[model samples]
Target: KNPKSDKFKVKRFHHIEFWCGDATNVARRFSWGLGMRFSAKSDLSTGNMVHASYLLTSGDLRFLFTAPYSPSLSAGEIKPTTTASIPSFDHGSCRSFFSSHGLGVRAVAIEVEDAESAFSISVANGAIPSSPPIVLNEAVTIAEVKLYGDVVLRYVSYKAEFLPGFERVEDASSFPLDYGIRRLDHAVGNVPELGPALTYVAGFTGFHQFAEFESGLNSAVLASNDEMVLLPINEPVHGTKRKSQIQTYLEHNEGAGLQHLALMSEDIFRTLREMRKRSSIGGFDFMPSPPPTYYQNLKKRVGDVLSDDQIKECEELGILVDRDDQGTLLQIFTKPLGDRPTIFIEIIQRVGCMMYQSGGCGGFGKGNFSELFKSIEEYEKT
Candidate 1:
């Protein structure tokens, strides 16, 4: 029933690792903006010589931000012993990655049944290993394989709250502020070409095609066996009157890398309302809303999945809507997460279709791509 080449199994995204210039500040920015709370950390105070790392979480969404202490420091200085060690956070590597792709995702960690088996099978299938499987505290295991550009695909087994070196944050709060973001809907990356990149990843991770998008760019979405983890790879489209946003991202990022992360919310109105309130301070600034015509014709687009009041609320908050036969999807995009226009955040909510079923309703905003691209083009002009 499955492809003979399929070997490893991925449960879902464990956590996404970002290489930042300032881990503490970036982590706090996301905390205030998205309502994710600080969970754990490893830094100089924790006796980690390599970098400062902070773990943030809200529901199933976890983000790990790391800032290296010194790019010149060699891994041999803080060398790993015969047994336990940190998986892929070497000072030299973190330094180079930060320099190349500032404030970008360096690793996408996936939960698996056996990290060792996955890594070995992937490597044997022509995947290059950044490092062999590393045991942590004799309970958790981690292995890394190089993905496109500088990004790495991390395989993890056994769910420990955080990695071994990280100590829990005592004052992590989740009281007054909650953005209603449940978990990752999907993560998208930009590559020079889709055919080769998709084939390589499919060969190693056993992911199969799930969806495709063609507007100003060409895209292909790949999903795990259970369909919990969806990764969309995008490439520039030739012969278009408009410039490909994917190409713009590649130039700014200096190479192929993660473009944006979509966070799923059960109640998008409430989530966007909370997010809008923080725009004046340290919160997210979403892209401008679609033209009046978009909301005017939304009823015709998605039918009665959402009420009039719900549609009105979306128009006010710049949320975009689309639907399939089963369910509807509401989504909105924030401005670039950092100074560069390379990466951004997407807040999404899917309605109808068994929420946990195979590829839940409200497809990946395929109908909204043209409008989305226009908004981005406008932003590029400024």
Candidate 2:
């Protein structure tokens, strides 16, 4: 894995931004369902008259949701005065973005040592520039580049709690609860084709190929030099008995976009148990379980990595298990988070390896691909 150009380096994902039609409702769902706390916001009260933005935080995870205000309102547009280069969304285009992708991630932000250098070097290396370097509150420098679909890659260098435009808001409902989610393990994207999209992303970000798989679809995992940021890209493979899951995501998404996000956890059993409690109320629905025979052969497949009770717990929760030379993996995927079967979430925990170590500890669930697709195919048949 040769380094394309190490002139600039990325730290980790700073935060992810979701562009949707209604920020309040989505933010509430994340708060009540995912156990995230509403931390900050930007709206008319905060002098951001164009759109409503809410920031939610759980442990090291931060998610921002933005929705435009109605044009009929007296709230006229106000350009970002801190730096003219910062991206500002008006009513029409913001709504248009939501219309095309629905409630999906529009920007993935990564922390960098220097935003200017990152932007300049990436653009010089043929990366499409979405925005030039801009300063926020004199403490944060930000730049942007296009990734795939309508999504953009934002490079940020900041010293404060967050960007300047938003004001801190405390979670006022109830006592803080732990959902066991630690951070973002990886974000998977679905594309019509893999080669070009993979080449474009890896070329610009200086990421190296981490792994590859061919089960119902073509998948290639890319990682930053430090392995803090992992992006798995998937392309549909035709001529299969059943339709490809990646193709389903692409068609329902109306284009190439993020398919799922895997959230790392120290104890997935506890995490899923807590999340499942919220499923019927304001939370997510998980995919159906694997057949009895699949779980029956768990010990034979993984060579007794887990005990009978642990395996039974996994089976009861519908969690999938797999292992590599490095370690073991326990993961489960939630159904689509929205009305359309596009974006979803995966809860995962790596065993027998350092949480922050390279190679994703147990690797991307390659061994469970067939089971996952089989489950999805069965569910989609309805």
Candidate 3:
């Protein structure tokens, strides 16, 4: 059962899977590093012979990590069926993927009403086919489509275990710290072919391109029906001595790739303030700084509506705020996560009654552009 012929139904935002060097170690960077918890895992002992998995969760953000490995079973234990359980014998596709992409986003999965229909519609709408729906019992059916840079846009029906064949990780941490993580606010990807790529995704998914901005400062924000999921596409603007953020990302990532992800926070001010404290004393990295003039201008635009203390806190912690017609939002970006300076993260909070789609608002608040773009100009100079 699908929606109207022209309408695509994406009920929920599922997990984003990454192929990394070590799932356990990298997940810890998020677990203890950003206060998340391990929820599920799949290993060779659990009938996963091709790869291992680690599912981490914090509010609405679910991240899955997979890695390839092997086991040393006794010769007596090595049966004819044992070869299927080893990557070396199984052709090592899992490891091969990681070898190709490195520790980066592998797929962006969304829970759909019908996997087959989603796949069919996407392909019909000009999406490159990745795989057909593989039914993992009546529980969940999965399919995939190739997006720009060969990133997998996966569609699947809901499942209790997230997909299937994964065991719940017992003794998962309680994640005591209040990182203020509420949900995945949005995911941004850098693109070399910005305009056509945005059109491709919007057309294939039947999504709406609500906001689109320029060449030197190119970014297009797309949304689902309810704005539960948003993707802000970025293309590095040219004609600068220092490379723009997108240009830096494209080169370091070996091509266009996942740029940064914005995580939602209930109290962005506090969340970012604490994050700053960590950067100062606890040795964590926050993003680059905004110009002092940015705050001066921000105060002018805001007047007394936001309060002195609010403005002071924002300036002190470097959180950027912006408003649409109905409401406002606060945001902050982080420095690159890996050695390549390609991937980073963002923290954002929607203020007042202004939800993203409410009254057909606006983009991911590029209100911080002068400061942000200037910061990039500063970032690449070294």
TM-scores of all predicted structures: 0.91, 0.91, 0.84
Candidate 2: residue pairs that collide: none
Model 3: per-residue Cα lDDT at residue 130: 82
Candidate 3 on 43-133: residue-level lDDT in tens? 6667766566788887778888776555443233343344222212222445665565567887788888888888998999998888777
What is each predicted model's overall lDDT from 0 to 1? 0.81, 0.80, 0.70
Candidate with best lDDT: 1
Model 1, C-alpha of 332: deviation from truth (Å): 0.8
Flag the better candidate by TM-score, 2 or 3.
Answer: 2
lDDT for model 1, please.
0.81
Candidate 2 residue spans exceeding 4 A from truth: 1-7, 71-86, 171-175, 212-214, 371-382
Question: Over the stretch 1-382, how does candidate 1's per-residue lDDT look in tens digits?
Answer: 2232347767888899898888989988888999888888888777676678888888888999888776344344634541113557766687788788888999888899999999999998878889789878888999999888899889999845688878888763433346898788888889999999999998887887874325568788888876778888999987778787888899899989999999988788888998899987998899877776677678876657778888888889989987776677889999999988999999998887773555535778887876555655665564
